Amino acid sequence: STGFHHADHVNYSSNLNKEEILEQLLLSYEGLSDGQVNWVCNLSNASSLIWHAYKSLAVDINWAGFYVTQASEENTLILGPFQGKVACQMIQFGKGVCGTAASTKETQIVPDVNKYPGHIACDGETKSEIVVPIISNDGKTLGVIDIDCLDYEGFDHVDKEFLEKLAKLINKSCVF
Amino acid sequence: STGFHHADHVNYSSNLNKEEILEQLLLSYEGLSDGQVNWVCNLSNASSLIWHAYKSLAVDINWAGFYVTQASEENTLILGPFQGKVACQMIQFGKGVCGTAASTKETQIVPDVNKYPGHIACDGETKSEIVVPIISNDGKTLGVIDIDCLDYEGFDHVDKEFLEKLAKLINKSCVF
Ligand SMILES: C[S@](=O)CC[C@H](N)C(=O)O
Numbered sequence A, B: 001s002t003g004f005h006h007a008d009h010v011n012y013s014s015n016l017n018k019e020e021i022l023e024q025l026l027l028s029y030e031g032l033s034d035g036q037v038n039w040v041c042n043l044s045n046a047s048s049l050i051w052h053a054y055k056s057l058a059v060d061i062n063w064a065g066f067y068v069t070q071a072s073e074e075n076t077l078i079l080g081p082f083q084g085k086v087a088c089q090m091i092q093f094g095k096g097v098c099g100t101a102a103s104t105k106e107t108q109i110v111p112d113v114n115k116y117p118g119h120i121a122c123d124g125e126t127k128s129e130i131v132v133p134i135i136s137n138d139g140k141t142l143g144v145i146d147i148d149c150l151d152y153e154g155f156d157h158v159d160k161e162f163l164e165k166l167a168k169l170i171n172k173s174c175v176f
């Protein structure tokens, strides 16, 4: 027996830098998602990883999780696993930050959500947000990775660059 | 606009008695799960409801979430949505507090997990636990509700009562 528990993946002593923490996240995700293709399992655990990483980073986040492209309908996101407070159930493609990322297939970084026309506030206290789409082999949107922050200007390119890797990893480790 | 956000469902106050908070949760779940039968969406929000309900009751919880019965395997639970730290992906019926809940179809209230034979420690810090089976119309285990606590003796039969109510709403409102 290793002495490790599954939960030990979210121990990031605060002395580590941003690069180390996020690189650890990606490695934790591989190890956790290796055993199964089940997307509910992999994203649930992924949400925990994202949440604790950012808390460890001293980013005042209030949401960390996913929306997934609905089975029957190609243009609707349905709420998936997440860490944080009760969230919006369904989001059309093209609508708000999440639907915008879904439609453009491109990452969205928003410094002030109240200044973002069309913003879908699931938590009224959210001031900033990043959304990164999860792209299939055939280039289609499978879902989005979404993070909310209680401060303005919470996310930048480092978050985008890392979350784009996590998405590729998810596509490769999950059957949607 | 109502001036309410989705997140408001878990903006309780710590001065409400246990009965008020738990019944508020049942109503919140009902309102939130009304517009779709999607089980991931419905169980995601439910993990948030449960998490914040117990934090507000000042129970030192470390985990609140679900395992669901595998589509392929009728004797296997697979990790579902949760609030908490990273947890075990898969649990066989009859194994651990979760798996025992599953095969016996009987709620497990555990005052000391280290004294529970075959307990599955996903988080090594867990000291107590309650697990409530979700039962189908045909009397079959669809999944379990699971809550971990950092102190011994975290839970009682009032928690069972309310969680059994919740498991019924989950059955009534979700398609697995
Ligand atoms: C505007 S965008 O769609 C943000 C909504 C997201 N579901 C959230 O919980 O913040």
Ligand SMILES: C[S@](=O)CC[C@H](N)C(=O)O
Pocket (backbone or CB within 6 Å): B063, B087, B088, B091, B095, B096, B097, B098, B099, B118, B119, B120, B121, B122, B123, B126, B129, B146, B148
């Ligand atoms: C022993 S029983 O399976 C409890 C462990 C559970 N998988 C958890 O989330 O902690």
